[model samples]
Target: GAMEDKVDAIREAIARNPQEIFQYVRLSQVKRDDKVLGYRVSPGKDPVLFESIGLQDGDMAVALNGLDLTDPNVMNTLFQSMNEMTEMSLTVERDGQQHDVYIQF
Candidate 1:
């Protein structure tokens, strides 16, 4: 249930914006080949947390707020504030239009 909890936390984080959540924001991909999940955090972006979780770059981050990573804004925001858990909403570009996603931590 840890993964579920993490997912829930991510959703909660996505729901809240401009506030802080976990020390770092991270997301992981659920792979069928590997039972364990894998994720990646940008360099110097919460090294402490990344080291603690054993994450490396190029790892597959399957979902965010239960949504796939197709928007640069989401990835940017997620990694931009990797070191600290900040409450912030996401502005996603859908159909070439920007929209605000309010998330509460």
Candidate 2:
């Protein structure tokens, strides 16, 4: 249950300082042809953590587990359901090609 413990600890930290969450990955909104695409990944202080999620600098995080990330609210939705997520499949676009990164809790 180490993963669950980690999740709980993280949730607690987030609850205490929500702004600290961005210290792991600095996400910026991305766009293409005047339409919102997703969020672009930028390594933060914890670049290793960012790498663990299979994201690199400049990668566009397009979706999560088949859910479109075009809407900013989707991230809030994901955060609210984090404890229930046993696995994650992040859809990313790099160099104009799509790729999936899988992570299991």
**Which candidate comes out best when scored by TM-score?**
2
Using all chains and alpha carbons, the TM-scores for the candidates as numbered come to 0.29, 0.64
**Candidate 2 wrongly placed segments (more than 4 Å):** 1-23, 32-34
* Clash-forming residue pairs, model 2: none
lDDT by candidate, in order shown: 0.43, 0.71
Model 2 agreement with the true structure over 5-97: per-residue lDDT tens digits = 665555456456554545766767776776779988787764655676678777988887677988757878866765555656788899999
Please estimate how well model 1 matches the true structure, expressed as its whole-model Cα lDDT.
0.43
Give me candidate 1's TM-score against the actual structure: 0.29
Ten-residue segment with the worst summed lDDT in candidate 1?
36-45
- Distance from true position, residue 66, model 2, in Å? 2.1
lDDT of the structure predicted as candidate 2 = 0.71
TM-score, prediction 2:
0.64
